[PDB]
Amino acid sequence: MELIRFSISIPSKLLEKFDQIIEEIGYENRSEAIRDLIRDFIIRHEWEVGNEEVAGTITIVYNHDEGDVVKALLDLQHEYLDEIISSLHVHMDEHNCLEVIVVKGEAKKIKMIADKLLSLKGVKHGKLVMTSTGKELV
């Protein structure tokens, strides 16, 4: 392990606004928040360049009684057995379901999976979260 210390200059008003926000959110300090920003930036780049394995979640909401969304979802997912690990389903109300799908694999593959799921007519709301396997981070 090796820690590298360096200085940076940030616009004063920007910094002031930043400190006010992270405190409200709950961060213990500015250094921790900035390191978090740097990790986030690196994770995003990981989804852009390379073929390294990434991980993510796809959250969707739908009415299971509407059309054939339920069948369509299953068929799409079973087509990607290698990337989809598992999914959590919560029955919101008599008609609405919330489902979150955990995926692991190549970035381009996962983004296509999200495209197909989110573009389904029955899917009302949805969002792909791009994150990491943590293997290459800390």
Window contacting Ni ion (CB under 5 A); options: 5-13, 27-35, 37-45, 108-116? 27-35
CA distance 94 to 111: 31
Cα separation, 94 vs 99, in Å, equals: 15
Residue 13 interacts with Cl ion (CB under 5 A)?
no
Q: State which of positions 77-136 bind its own copies (CB under 8 A).
A: 77-78, 81, 84-98, 100, 102, 104, 115-116, 118-121, 124-127, 129-136
- Rounded to whole angstroms, how far apart are CA atoms 32 and 25? 13
Q: Is 78 annotated as a binding-site member? A: yes
Instruction: Decide: helix, strand or coil at residue 30.
Output: helix
Q: How far apart are CA 127 and CA 30, in angstroms?
A: 29
Which of 128, 133, 11 has its CA nearest to residue 60?
A: 128
> What number of chain residues touch its own copies (CB under 8 A)?
92
Task: Using CB under 8 A, pick the residue from 64, 72, 106, 109 that binds its own copies.
Answer: 64
Pick one of 6, 13, 24, 93: the residue that binds Cl ion (CB under 5 A). Answer: 6
Chain residues in the site for Cl ion (CB under 5 A): 6
